[PDB]
Amino acid sequence: EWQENKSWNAHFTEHKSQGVVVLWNENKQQGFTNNLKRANQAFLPASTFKIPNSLIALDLGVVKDEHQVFKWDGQTRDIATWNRDHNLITAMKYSVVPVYQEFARQIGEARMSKMLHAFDYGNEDISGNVDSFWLDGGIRISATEQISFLRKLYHNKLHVSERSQRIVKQAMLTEANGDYIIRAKTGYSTRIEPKIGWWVGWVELDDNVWFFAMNMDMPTSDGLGLRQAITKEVLKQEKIIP
Template sequence: MKTLRRLAPTVPLCIAALLAAPVAHARTLCTVIADADTGEFVVKQGRCDERVTPASTFKIALALMGFDSGFLKNEHAPVLPFREGYPAWNESWKQPTDPQRWLKYSVFWFSQRVTYALGKERFARYAEEFAYGNADVSGDPGKGNGLERSWVSSSLKISPLEQIGFVRKLIHDQLPVSRGASEMTRRTIEAIELPDGWTAHGKTGTAYPKMPDGSSDEAHGYGWYVGWITKGKKSFVFARLDQDEKKASPPTGLRVRDSLLPTLPALLGPTAK
């Protein structure tokens, strides 16, 4: 059975204050929430149509590809070993990893195992069929590294509005994959219990813009939190995108998630009843 994280209740704040409060050292580029059934916006604030790197939020799409292709079997299979030479920017990545752990800890090398198993043509075809942002998984110009990192500060870009459109298709089984792949992806994505009976399902993402010399601009990292929130028969899709104004820790995406989650039920307001 899937383990749910619980978020402690917080004191309600006014909607304007919730929207205005950015992550420390960051500015909010977009907050968008929509009814998952009708697509009607509940909140739409900021530059929500501008595309940036999806970073690790793309793991939602990768999970769909992996389960549909058969490379991924279920939440706990396959278990892949960490090997020397794999990216290991985080100590939590240096362990055997299954699909659920991959998404929870955002294990970069596991993503690469999925893309290598797919191969360039099938990987590109899935991105096109999903209509995922600009669907460009070619990677950095002239480097041929699309399978390695096209979704991290590279060729692939998506807007917050496109993110929630993609999530709506996922939860309604409207993407060109098997129903089993959609169901398994939804089961594998981290779920967090919120106050008042709500449950949020989502994925964080952090990436740094490229400088002219190819280095990473770690002072202006992008941070995403993308997913859906449910209570009974009510479901809403959401995307939040921030950008740091100075170097900070933990990673921007984690700070976005932790600042947005306590506010989500209040942001829904009367539409949630």
């Protein structure tokens, strides 16, 4: 069911880094990784939490649809793309933390905890501040656990409406061409050691789907582009994408 290929570590060590990539072949129900131990180690989800947060906000009516405008609160932040109005699509695309912090405040502790348990999401622990627990609270999730959650979303099997799941999968759209579609979400965790980057999602082909979840050491922001680049290089090596 699971195969470990330690030779794939070169994808990370060649960049003076360390990390894990986990792949899941949906048709064959088989998984692959470079490091079984790190594949099951739990990290802060950081901005990958925008996936469950979006689902919960939509299903509770906190967000009406993907067109609703969330007005900039007028506070200048150091990320230029955050100093503007957003909807669900652009908030996901630019990982706009302050929009999702307001989502969480409106969801509230009780409903957030209840829904993460219903999702079987990570350690299901929202200890910390309701508007930042996915950045510096007690919640943790592993790469393998990300795969399990994403598979439920793909199949519309999460305990929210089909509509809510379709809208979030639209918002996850990252790349599409004549060969494949990628729906995914990046993450960047800096408030608790070790600092890491995430990329989780899946690749749609004509006749199969490959789920993926990766994290890697991220001592500075200079390496953030390696999250997608390394993953796509693994996918190409495995002849999943051209």
